[PDB]
Amino acid sequence: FGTGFG
Amino acid sequence: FGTGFG
Amino acid sequence: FGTGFG
Amino acid sequence: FGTGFG
Amino acid sequence: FGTGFG
Amino acid sequence: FGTGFG
Amino acid sequence: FGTGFG
Amino acid sequence: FGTGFG
Amino acid sequence: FGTGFG
Amino acid sequence: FGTGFG
Amino acid sequence: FGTGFG
Amino acid sequence: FGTGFG
Amino acid sequence: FGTGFG
Amino acid sequence: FGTGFG
Amino acid sequence: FGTGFG
Amino acid sequence: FGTGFG
Amino acid sequence: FGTGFG
Amino acid sequence: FGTGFG
Amino acid sequence: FGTGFG
Amino acid sequence: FGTGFG
């Protein structure tokens, strides 16, 4: 899995 | 923004 | 699956 | 906006 | 399936 | 707007 | 199936 | 939007 | 197989 | 957005 | 196999 | 964003 | 195998 | 921003 | 960000 | 796994 | 094997 | 910022 | 940052 | 084997 926010 | 996969 | 918002 | 698939 | 709004 | 399929 | 509004 | 299968 | 977009 | 499988 | 983007 | 597998 | 980005 | 995978 | 395996 | 913020 | 970055 | 892997 | 193994 | 940096 992979995730990011910004 | 935010994103994810898995 | 995959998801995003922004 | 928002989106998803799975 | 797939979905989006915006 | 909004959309989906499945 | 598929659907949309806007 | 659109979808199909076979 | 199947595909969709929106 | 879009998705597919086979 | 499968793929998607958004 | 995007993802796939096979 | 699989891959994703965001 | 923040990100992770695993 | 991104990730993959095989 | 891997993670970062900033 | 696997790899990722962010 | 901060980061880690393992 | 990044990481990998095999 | 494995490697990483940050």
Short mmCIF file of N, CA and C in Angstrom, two decimals:
data_model
loop_
_atom_site.label_atom_id
_atom_site.label_comp_id
_atom_site.label_asym_id
_atom_site.label_seq_id
_atom_site.Cartn_x
_atom_site.Cartn_y
_atom_site.Cartn_z
N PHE A 1 0.86 -1.20 0.00
CA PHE A 1 0.00 0.00 0.00
C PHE A 1 0.90 1.25 0.00
N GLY A 2 0.28 2.38 -0.30
CA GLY A 2 0.98 3.67 -0.28
C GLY A 2 0.00 4.77 0.01
N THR A 3 0.45 5.83 0.68
CA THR A 3 -0.44 6.94 1.00
C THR A 3 0.37 8.23 1.07
N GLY A 4 -0.32 9.32 0.83
CA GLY A 4 0.28 10.64 1.04
C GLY A 4 -0.78 11.71 1.16
N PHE A 5 -0.40 12.79 1.82
CA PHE A 5 -1.26 13.99 1.92
C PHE A 5 -0.35 15.21 1.86
N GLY A 6 -0.95 16.33 1.49
CA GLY A 6 -0.19 17.59 1.54
C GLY A 6 -0.96 18.74 0.92
N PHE B 1 -4.79 17.94 -0.16
CA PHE B 1 -5.19 16.72 -0.89
C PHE B 1 -4.71 15.50 -0.10
N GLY B 2 -5.25 14.35 -0.46
CA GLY B 2 -4.84 13.07 0.15
C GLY B 2 -5.06 11.95 -0.82
N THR B 3 -4.23 10.92 -0.76
CA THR B 3 -4.37 9.79 -1.67
C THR B 3 -3.87 8.52 -1.00
N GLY B 4 -4.39 7.41 -1.45
CA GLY B 4 -3.87 6.11 -1.02
C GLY B 4 -4.28 5.01 -1.97
N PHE B 5 -3.50 3.95 -1.97
CA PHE B 5 -3.81 2.73 -2.74
C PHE B 5 -3.37 1.54 -1.91
N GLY B 6 -3.97 0.39 -2.23
CA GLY B 6 -3.51 -0.84 -1.57
C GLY B 6 -4.40 -2.03 -1.90
N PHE C 1 -7.30 -1.34 -4.65
CA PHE C 1 -8.17 -0.14 -4.65
C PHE C 1 -7.27 1.10 -4.65
N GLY C 2 -7.89 2.23 -4.96
CA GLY C 2 -7.18 3.53 -4.93
C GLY C 2 -8.17 4.63 -4.65
N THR C 3 -7.71 5.68 -3.98
CA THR C 3 -8.60 6.80 -3.65
C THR C 3 -7.80 8.09 -3.58
N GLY C 4 -8.48 9.18 -3.82
CA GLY C 4 -7.89 10.50 -3.61
C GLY C 4 -8.94 11.57 -3.49
N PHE C 5 -8.57 12.65 -2.83
CA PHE C 5 -9.42 13.85 -2.73
C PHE C 5 -8.51 15.06 -2.79
N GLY C 6 -9.12 16.19 -3.16
CA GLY C 6 -8.35 17.44 -3.12
C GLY C 6 -9.12 18.60 -3.73
N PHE D 1 -12.95 17.80 -4.82
CA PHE D 1 -13.36 16.58 -5.54
C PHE D 1 -12.87 15.36 -4.75
N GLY D 2 -13.42 14.21 -5.11
CA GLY D 2 -13.00 12.93 -4.50
C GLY D 2 -13.23 11.81 -5.48
N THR D 3 -12.39 10.78 -5.41
CA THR D 3 -12.54 9.64 -6.32
C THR D 3 -12.03 8.37 -5.65
N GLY D 4 -12.56 7.27 -6.10
CA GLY D 4 -12.04 5.97 -5.68
C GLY D 4 -12.45 4.87 -6.63
N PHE D 5 -11.66 3.81 -6.63
CA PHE D 5 -11.98 2.59 -7.40
C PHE D 5 -11.53 1.40 -6.57
N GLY D 6 -12.13 0.25 -6.88
CA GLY D 6 -11.67 -0.98 -6.23
C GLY D 6 -12.56 -2.17 -6.56
N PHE E 1 -15.47 -1.49 -9.31
CA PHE E 1 -16.33 -0.28 -9.31
C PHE E 1 -15.43 0.96 -9.31
N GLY E 2 -16.05 2.09 -9.61
CA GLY E 2 -15.35 3.39 -9.59
C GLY E 2 -16.33 4.49 -9.30
N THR E 3 -15.88 5.54 -8.63
CA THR E 3 -16.77 6.66 -8.31
C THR E 3 -15.96 7.95 -8.24
N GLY E 4 -16.65 9.03 -8.48
CA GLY E 4 -16.05 10.35 -8.26
C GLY E 4 -17.11 11.43 -8.14
N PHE E 5 -16.74 12.51 -7.49
CA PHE E 5 -17.59 13.71 -7.39
C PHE E 5 -16.68 14.92 -7.44
N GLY E 6 -17.28 16.05 -7.82
CA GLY E 6 -16.52 17.30 -7.77
C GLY E 6 -17.29 18.46 -8.38
N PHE F 1 -21.12 17.66 -9.47
CA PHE F 1 -21.53 16.44 -10.20
C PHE F 1 -21.04 15.21 -9.41
N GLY F 2 -21.58 14.06 -9.77
CA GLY F 2 -21.17 12.79 -9.15
C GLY F 2 -21.39 11.66 -10.13
N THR F 3 -20.56 10.63 -10.07
CA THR F 3 -20.70 9.50 -10.98
C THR F 3 -20.20 8.23 -10.30
N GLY F 4 -20.73 7.13 -10.75
CA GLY F 4 -20.21 5.83 -10.33
C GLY F 4 -20.61 4.72 -11.28
N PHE F 5 -19.83 3.67 -11.28
CA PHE F 5 -20.14 2.45 -12.05
C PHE F 5 -19.70 1.25 -11.22
N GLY F 6 -20.30 0.11 -11.53
CA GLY F 6 -19.84 -1.12 -10.88
C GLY F 6 -20.73 -2.31 -11.21
N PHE G 1 -23.63 -1.63 -13.96
CA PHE G 1 -24.50 -0.43 -13.96
C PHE G 1 -23.60 0.82 -13.96
N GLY G 2 -24.22 1.95 -14.27
CA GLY G 2 -23.51 3.24 -14.24
C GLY G 2 -24.50 4.35 -13.95
N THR G 3 -24.04 5.40 -13.29
CA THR G 3 -24.93 6.51 -12.96
C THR G 3 -24.13 7.81 -12.89
N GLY G 4 -24.81 8.89 -13.13
CA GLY G 4 -24.22 10.21 -12.92
C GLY G 4 -25.27 11.29 -12.80
N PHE G 5 -24.90 12.37 -12.14
CA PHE G 5 -25.75 13.57 -12.04
C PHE G 5 -24.85 14.78 -12.10
N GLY G 6 -25.45 15.90 -12.47
CA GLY G 6 -24.69 17.16 -12.43
C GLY G 6 -25.46 18.32 -13.04
N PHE H 1 -19.25 9.69 -18.17
CA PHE H 1 -18.67 8.45 -17.58
C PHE H 1 -19.05 7.28 -18.49
N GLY H 2 -18.41 6.14 -18.33
CA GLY H 2 -18.76 4.96 -19.11
C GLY H 2 -18.17 3.73 -18.48
N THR H 3 -18.71 2.58 -18.89
CA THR H 3 -18.21 1.30 -18.39
C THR H 3 -18.54 0.22 -19.40
N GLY H 4 -17.82 -0.89 -19.33
CA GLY H 4 -18.16 -2.07 -20.13
C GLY H 4 -17.46 -3.28 -19.57
N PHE H 5 -17.95 -4.43 -20.00
CA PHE H 5 -17.31 -5.70 -19.61
C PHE H 5 -17.54 -6.70 -20.74
N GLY H 6 -16.71 -7.73 -20.70
CA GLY H 6 -16.95 -8.89 -21.58
C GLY H 6 -16.22 -10.15 -21.12
N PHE I 1 -13.39 -9.52 -18.38
CA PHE I 1 -12.62 -8.25 -18.19
C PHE I 1 -13.63 -7.11 -18.08
N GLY I 2 -13.19 -5.95 -17.62
CA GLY I 2 -14.07 -4.79 -17.55
C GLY I 2 -13.26 -3.53 -17.38
N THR I 3 -13.92 -2.41 -17.65
CA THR I 3 -13.26 -1.10 -17.49
C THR I 3 -14.33 -0.05 -17.28
N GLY I 4 -13.93 1.08 -16.71
CA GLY I 4 -14.83 2.24 -16.61
C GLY I 4 -14.02 3.47 -16.31
N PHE I 5 -14.67 4.60 -16.54
CA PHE I 5 -14.05 5.90 -16.21
C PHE I 5 -15.16 6.87 -15.84
N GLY I 6 -14.73 7.93 -15.17
CA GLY I 6 -15.64 9.06 -14.93
C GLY I 6 -14.90 10.35 -14.57
N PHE J 1 -11.08 9.84 -13.52
CA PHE J 1 -10.50 8.59 -12.93
C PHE J 1 -10.89 7.43 -13.84
N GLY J 2 -10.24 6.28 -13.67
CA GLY J 2 -10.60 5.10 -14.45
C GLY J 2 -10.00 3.87 -13.82
N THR J 3 -10.55 2.73 -14.24
CA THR J 3 -10.04 1.44 -13.73
C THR J 3 -10.37 0.36 -14.74
N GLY J 4 -9.65 -0.75 -14.68
CA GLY J 4 -9.99 -1.93 -15.48
C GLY J 4 -9.29 -3.14 -14.92
N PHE J 5 -9.78 -4.29 -15.35
CA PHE J 5 -9.15 -5.56 -14.96
C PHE J 5 -9.37 -6.55 -16.09
N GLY J 6 -8.55 -7.59 -16.05
CA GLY J 6 -8.78 -8.75 -16.93
C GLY J 6 -8.06 -10.00 -16.46
N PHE K 1 -5.22 -9.38 -13.72
CA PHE K 1 -4.45 -8.11 -13.54
C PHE K 1 -5.46 -6.97 -13.43
N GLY K 2 -5.02 -5.81 -12.97
CA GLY K 2 -5.90 -4.65 -12.89
C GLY K 2 -5.09 -3.39 -12.72
N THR K 3 -5.75 -2.27 -13.00
CA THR K 3 -5.10 -0.96 -12.84
C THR K 3 -6.17 0.09 -12.63
N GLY K 4 -5.77 1.23 -12.06
CA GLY K 4 -6.66 2.38 -11.95
C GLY K 4 -5.86 3.62 -11.66
N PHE K 5 -6.51 4.74 -11.88
CA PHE K 5 -5.88 6.04 -11.55
C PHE K 5 -6.99 7.01 -11.18
N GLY K 6 -6.57 8.07 -10.51
CA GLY K 6 -7.47 9.20 -10.28
C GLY K 6 -6.74 10.49 -9.91
N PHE L 1 -2.92 9.98 -8.86
CA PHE L 1 -2.34 8.73 -8.27
C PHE L 1 -2.72 7.57 -9.18
N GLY L 2 -2.08 6.43 -9.02
CA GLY L 2 -2.43 5.25 -9.80
C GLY L 2 -1.84 4.01 -9.17
N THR L 3 -2.38 2.87 -9.58
CA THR L 3 -1.87 1.58 -9.08
C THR L 3 -2.21 0.50 -10.09
N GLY L 4 -1.49 -0.61 -10.02
CA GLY L 4 -1.82 -1.79 -10.83
C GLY L 4 -1.13 -3.00 -10.26
N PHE L 5 -1.62 -4.14 -10.69
CA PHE L 5 -0.98 -5.42 -10.31
C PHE L 5 -1.20 -6.41 -11.43
N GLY L 6 -0.38 -7.45 -11.39
CA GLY L 6 -0.61 -8.60 -12.28
C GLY L 6 0.11 -9.86 -11.81
N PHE M 1 2.94 -9.24 -9.07
CA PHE M 1 3.71 -7.97 -8.88
C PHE M 1 2.70 -6.83 -8.77
N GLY M 2 3.14 -5.67 -8.31
CA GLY M 2 2.26 -4.51 -8.24
C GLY M 2 3.07 -3.25 -8.07
N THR M 3 2.41 -2.13 -8.34
CA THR M 3 3.07 -0.82 -8.18
C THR M 3 2.00 0.24 -7.97
N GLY M 4 2.40 1.37 -7.40
CA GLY M 4 1.50 2.52 -7.30
C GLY M 4 2.31 3.76 -7.00
N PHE M 5 1.66 4.88 -7.23
CA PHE M 5 2.28 6.18 -6.90
C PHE M 5 1.17 7.15 -6.53
N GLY M 6 1.60 8.21 -5.86
CA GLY M 6 0.69 9.35 -5.62
C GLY M 6 1.43 10.63 -5.26
N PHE N 1 3.38 18.09 4.49
CA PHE N 1 2.97 16.86 3.76
C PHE N 1 3.46 15.64 4.55
N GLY N 2 2.91 14.49 4.20
CA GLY N 2 3.33 13.21 4.81
C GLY N 2 3.10 12.09 3.83
N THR N 3 3.94 11.06 3.90
CA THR N 3 3.79 9.93 2.98
C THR N 3 4.30 8.66 3.66
N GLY N 4 3.77 7.55 3.21
CA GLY N 4 4.29 6.25 3.63
C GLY N 4 3.89 5.15 2.68
N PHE N 5 4.67 4.09 2.68
CA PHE N 5 4.35 2.87 1.91
C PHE N 5 4.80 1.68 2.74
N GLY N 6 4.20 0.54 2.43
CA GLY N 6 4.66 -0.70 3.08
C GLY N 6 3.77 -1.89 2.75
N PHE O 1 5.25 10.12 -4.21
CA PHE O 1 5.83 8.88 -3.62
C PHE O 1 5.44 7.71 -4.53
N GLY O 2 6.09 6.57 -4.37
CA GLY O 2 5.74 5.39 -5.14
C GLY O 2 6.33 4.16 -4.52
N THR O 3 5.78 3.01 -4.93
CA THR O 3 6.29 1.72 -4.42
C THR O 3 5.96 0.64 -5.43
N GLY O 4 6.68 -0.47 -5.37
CA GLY O 4 6.34 -1.64 -6.17
C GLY O 4 7.04 -2.85 -5.61
N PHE O 5 6.55 -4.00 -6.04
CA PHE O 5 7.18 -5.27 -5.65
C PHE O 5 6.96 -6.27 -6.78
N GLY O 6 7.78 -7.31 -6.74
CA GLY O 6 7.55 -8.46 -7.62
C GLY O 6 8.27 -9.72 -7.15
N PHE P 1 9.03 -1.06 4.65
CA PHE P 1 8.17 0.14 4.65
C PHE P 1 9.06 1.39 4.65
N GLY P 2 8.45 2.52 4.35
CA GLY P 2 9.15 3.81 4.37
C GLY P 2 8.16 4.92 4.66
N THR P 3 8.62 5.97 5.33
CA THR P 3 7.73 7.08 5.65
C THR P 3 8.53 8.38 5.73
N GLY P 4 7.85 9.46 5.49
CA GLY P 4 8.44 10.78 5.70
C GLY P 4 7.39 11.86 5.82
N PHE P 5 7.76 12.93 6.48
CA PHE P 5 6.91 14.13 6.58
C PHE P 5 7.82 15.35 6.52
N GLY P 6 7.21 16.47 6.15
CA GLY P 6 7.98 17.73 6.19
C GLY P 6 7.21 18.89 5.58
N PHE Q 1 11.11 -9.09 -4.41
CA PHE Q 1 11.88 -7.83 -4.23
C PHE Q 1 10.87 -6.68 -4.12
N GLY Q 2 11.31 -5.52 -3.66
CA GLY Q 2 10.43 -4.37 -3.59
C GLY Q 2 11.24 -3.11 -3.41
N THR Q 3 10.58 -1.98 -3.69
CA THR Q 3 11.23 -0.68 -3.53
C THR Q 3 10.17 0.38 -3.32
N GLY Q 4 10.56 1.51 -2.75
CA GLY Q 4 9.67 2.66 -2.65
C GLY Q 4 10.48 3.90 -2.35
N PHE Q 5 9.83 5.03 -2.57
CA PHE Q 5 10.45 6.32 -2.24
C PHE Q 5 9.34 7.29 -1.87
N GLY Q 6 9.76 8.35 -1.20
CA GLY Q 6 8.86 9.49 -0.97
C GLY Q 6 9.59 10.77 -0.61
N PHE R 1 11.55 18.23 9.15
CA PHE R 1 11.14 17.00 8.42
C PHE R 1 11.63 15.78 9.21
N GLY R 2 11.08 14.63 8.85
CA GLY R 2 11.49 13.36 9.46
C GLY R 2 11.27 12.23 8.48
N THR R 3 12.10 11.20 8.55
CA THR R 3 11.96 10.07 7.64
C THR R 3 12.46 8.80 8.31
N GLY R 4 11.94 7.69 7.86
CA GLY R 4 12.46 6.40 8.29
C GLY R 4 12.05 5.29 7.33
N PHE R 5 12.83 4.23 7.33
CA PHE R 5 12.52 3.01 6.57
C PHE R 5 12.96 1.82 7.40
N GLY R 6 12.37 0.68 7.08
CA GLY R 6 12.82 -0.56 7.74
C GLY R 6 11.94 -1.74 7.40
N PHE S 1 13.41 10.26 0.45
CA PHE S 1 13.99 9.02 1.04
C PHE S 1 13.61 7.85 0.13
N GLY S 2 14.25 6.71 0.29
CA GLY S 2 13.90 5.53 -0.49
C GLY S 2 14.49 4.30 0.14
N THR S 3 13.95 3.15 -0.27
CA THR S 3 14.46 1.86 0.23
C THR S 3 14.12 0.79 -0.78
N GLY S 4 14.84 -0.33 -0.71
CA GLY S 4 14.51 -1.50 -1.52
C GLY S 4 15.21 -2.71 -0.95
N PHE S 5 14.71 -3.86 -1.38
CA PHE S 5 15.35 -5.13 -1.00
C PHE S 5 15.13 -6.13 -2.12
N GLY S 6 15.95 -7.16 -2.09
CA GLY S 6 15.72 -8.32 -2.97
C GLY S 6 16.44 -9.58 -2.50
N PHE T 1 19.27 -8.95 0.24
CA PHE T 1 20.04 -7.68 0.42
C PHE T 1 19.03 -6.54 0.54
N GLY T 2 19.47 -5.38 0.99
CA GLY T 2 18.59 -4.22 1.07
C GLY T 2 19.40 -2.97 1.24
N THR T 3 18.74 -1.84 0.97
CA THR T 3 19.40 -0.53 1.13
C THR T 3 18.33 0.52 1.34
N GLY T 4 18.73 1.65 1.91
CA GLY T 4 17.83 2.81 2.01
C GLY T 4 18.64 4.04 2.30
N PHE T 5 17.99 5.17 2.08
CA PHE T 5 18.61 6.47 2.41
C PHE T 5 17.50 7.44 2.78
N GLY T 6 17.93 8.50 3.45
CA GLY T 6 17.02 9.63 3.69
C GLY T 6 17.76 10.92 4.05
#
